[model samples]
Target: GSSGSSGSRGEDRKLFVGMLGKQQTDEDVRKMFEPFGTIDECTVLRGPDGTSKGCAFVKFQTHAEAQAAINTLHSSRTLPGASSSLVVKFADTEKESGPSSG
Candidate 1:
């Protein structure tokens, strides 16, 4: 008896990493998380002009992998050229739904 969205698959395995140096690239981001587990997707945010936004998303194959990355890297991970620590969190995949209908 469940409300449907209850299961191991309900979790999102993506991580949002910020405070990256503007010069950081996808390879650099990948290297940081490679030790955790298999990464399904990884990207560094960029503008229309293709400049790094100092942020990135990394999607692992499982929630456990993502959690491990967060536990070990959050506030301690930093890009090679960054002067500050990085911020890591579960990526919010919720859609921006309009006001709920009661």
Candidate 2:
């Protein structure tokens, strides 16, 4: 239940990474996640001058790849000096998967 692939179910690629401080920025997330697999989306923004209430949401190109990132990331959710707990999990929806035309 902690690894492997899946079928046409297109829900596992989305990830929730939260409880962040100034320590981890949106770009920081991409740098770490981009290698897990091609990134479909990686961000934590509510405004150009704002952040995701101190958090992030990443969607990898593949479920298996994202899963591995999770395994590798959550392993260190308790980042030293992080000043918060790292929240990681599957998201039913994401801004990238569904966005409004501006």
Candidate 3:
């Protein structure tokens, strides 16, 4: 389906954004995502030297917000200073196992 909202049930409203420039900061990422939805948390991955790893993650207030973000940003190649095309998608969350054997 064209709607990216499917398969998002019960999952954290988190997204993975990559292909960012090394110089991009947490604030930069925050600004880029703020308009999409209420952000619960946002962070740009950094190296041991405290430089951007060219990637980041954002957690929205709801899965619908995250889905809207993915729909809006993915394939747009938007975001300043991105070394390459932006890569946006849902972040992996913990999987639920069946009831305990015992």
Question: Can you write out model 3's per-residue Cα lDDT over 41-60, one digit (the tens) per residue?
Answer: 89778889887777899998
lDDT of 3: 0.77
Could you tell which candidate, 1 or 2, scores higher by lDDT?
Answer: 1
**C-alpha lDDT of residue 75 in model 3:** 58
Q: Write the per-residue lDDT of candidate 1 for residues 1-102, one digit (tens) a residue.
A: 655432333368888898887666788778778788788899888989888877899999888888877776888866677767888878878678787885
Which residue runs does candidate 3 get wrong by more than 4 Å?
Answer: 1-10, 78-83, 94-99
Most TM-score-accurate candidate: 3
TM-score for every candidate vs. truth?
0.75, 0.64, 0.76
Q: Write the per-residue lDDT of candidate 2 for residues 12-85, one digit (tens) a residue.
A: 78787866766567777788678677788887856576644666889888888887676666645664456555
Candidate 1's C-alpha runs over 4 A off are 1-10, 80-83, 96-102
lDDT, ranked from best to worst: 1, 3, 2
Candidate 2, number of clashes: 0
